[PDB]
Amino acid sequence: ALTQPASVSGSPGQSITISCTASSDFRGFSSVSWYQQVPGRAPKLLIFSVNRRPSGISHRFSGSKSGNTASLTISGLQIEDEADYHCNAYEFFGGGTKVFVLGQPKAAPSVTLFPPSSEELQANKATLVCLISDFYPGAVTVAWKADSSPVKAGVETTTPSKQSNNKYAASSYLSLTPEQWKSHKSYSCQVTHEGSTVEKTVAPT
Amino acid sequence: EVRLVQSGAEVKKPGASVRVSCAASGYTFTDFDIHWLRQAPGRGLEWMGWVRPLGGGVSYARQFQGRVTMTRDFYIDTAFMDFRNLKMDDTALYFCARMGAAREWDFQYWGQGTRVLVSSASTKGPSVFPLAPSSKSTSGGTAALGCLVKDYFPEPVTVSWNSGALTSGVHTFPAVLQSSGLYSLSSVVTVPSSSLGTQTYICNVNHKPSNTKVDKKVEPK
Numbered sequence: 001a002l003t004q005p006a007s008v009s010g011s012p013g014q015s016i017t018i019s020c021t022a023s024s025d026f027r028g029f030s031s032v033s034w035y036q037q038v039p040g041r042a043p044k045l046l047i048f049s050v051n052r053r054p055s056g057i058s059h060r061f062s063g064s065k066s067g068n069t070a071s072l073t074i075s076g077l078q079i080e081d082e083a084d085y086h087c088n089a090y091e092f093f094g095g096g097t098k099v100f101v102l103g104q105p106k107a108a109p110s111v112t113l114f115p116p117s118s119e120e121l122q123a124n125k126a127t128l129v130c131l132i133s134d135f136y137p138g139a140v141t142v143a144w145k146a147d148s149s150p151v152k153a154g155v156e157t158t159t160p161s162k163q164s165n166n167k168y169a170a171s172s173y174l175s176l177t178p179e180q181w182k183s184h185k186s187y188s189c190q191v192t193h194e195g196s197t198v199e200k201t202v203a204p205t
Numbered sequence: 206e207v208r209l210v211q212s213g214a215e216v217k218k219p220g221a222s223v224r225v226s227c228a229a230s231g232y233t234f235t236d237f238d239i240h241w242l243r244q245a246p247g248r249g250l251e252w253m254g255w256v257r258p259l260g261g262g263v264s265y266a267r268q269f270q271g272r273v274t275m276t277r278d279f280y281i282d283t284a285f286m287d288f289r290n291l292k293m294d295d296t297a298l299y300f301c302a303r304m305g306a307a308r309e310w311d312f313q314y315w316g317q318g319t320r321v322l323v324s325s326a327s328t329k330g331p332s333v334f335p336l337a338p339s340s341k342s343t344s345g346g347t348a349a350l351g352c353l354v355k356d357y358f359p360e361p362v363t364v365s366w367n368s369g370a371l372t373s374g375v376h377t378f379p380a381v382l383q384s385s386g387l388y389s390l391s392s393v394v395t396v397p398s399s400s401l402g403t404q405t406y407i408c409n410v411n412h413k414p415s416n417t418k419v420d421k422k423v424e425p426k
Contacts, residue, residue: 004249031310033310040298042316044315045305047309048311048313086250090310091310092252093249093250099378112349114337114342117334117337127355127389128336138414158379168347171391202341
């Protein structure tokens with residue numbers, strides 16, 4: 001019964017604020033806690049009673065409350081602040097908020113497209129593998145094309161994950177029958193990132 | 206000094222059971238309840254219940270009553286969460302947690318998390334297909350070749366090249382989850398394009414859950 005924004009973006013040095021709103025009927029909302037969590041890892045308590053912070057937590061994190069709405073403010077945004085943030089009051093938790101820190105210059109993706117191997121076609125299967133890497137930020141739109149027609153069915157795209165060099169990578173797979181692959185002139189993996197597009201094409205030849 | 210250590214990841218079929226332990230240390234075990242929470246994929250945290258080491262009292266959210274049993278062994282300061290008759294939507298990252306000394310529902314101490322995957326899929330070794338290099342995968346002085354590690358379950362697989370002798374240029378991408386419940390990933394290595402006719406390239410795929418190891422030679426085609 002706690003509502004948080006889906007995401008909040010900022011650039012280093014700025015101050016951002018994440019809200020946590022309870023229902024109108026909520027009598028215990030004065031003991032709000034805030035947590036930082038790298039996805040897949042244990043949360044870390046940041047603020048635990050509107051504004052109290054444990055020992056070892058940066059003073060750049062501060063909490064406040066105005067009626068039914070609590071707020072976590074991050075002063076002097078740093079790249080290390082890029083994580084998920086959760087609020088809770090008693091057993092009730094918010095949905096979580098993804099925080100993005102735009103701390104790198106824009107970087108165009110490199111796209112590599114592999115056709116189905118003949119060894120997979122012999123098994124009467126066919127997979128097109130599109131690998132996207134070294135782009136920043138991590139918001140790409142991947143679109144597949146059969147000849148020039150958009151393809152919706154059979155596509156599976158991962159969410160962009162960070163690499164060692166702080167840039168993102170992702171992979172998109174197009175599953176099709178061998179007859180679908182051999183009956184078209186070509187297939188294309190179209191990657192659009194920050195208004196620019198990189199397109200790779202393969203043909204059953 | 207305060208530590209909460211949970212047991213390892215689990216993979217189950219709908220209708221099976223699972224026991225997750227939480228070994229506590231660094232404080233007096235009977236002074237704090239041990240809470241249990243879970244995080245579904247792409248979702249927030251969800252409180253499940255707690256167990257009281259002193260006396261063994263428990264409390265549960267409604268949707269877990271009748272399927273979740275929380276206990277403790279106070280001689281070894283370990284709490285247990287028994288989840289029976291699992292459903293597919295019980296797939297989550299499970300946490301045990303302890304409140305801070307303020308005891309104001311501020312979870313200052315968390316276990317490292319336990320992955321519980323509930324899927325109707327069964328263990329399956331991967332099919333390894335070569336991603337052969339061609340003129341449409343070369344970038345001047347370098348060429349991209351790889352291996353398609355297709356339709357395995359569950360995670361993970363590890364991929365190396367030439368028995369670990371090939372390190373630079375290797376990029377193993379995170380796996381994708383097909384709608385069939387099976388996983389697939391790709392592993393590509395950037396190599397000098399002049400070496401395509403002389404150097405042998407072999408990806409070594411290891412899938413411990415199925416006890417399967419595949420060595421796939423990749424050559425230009």
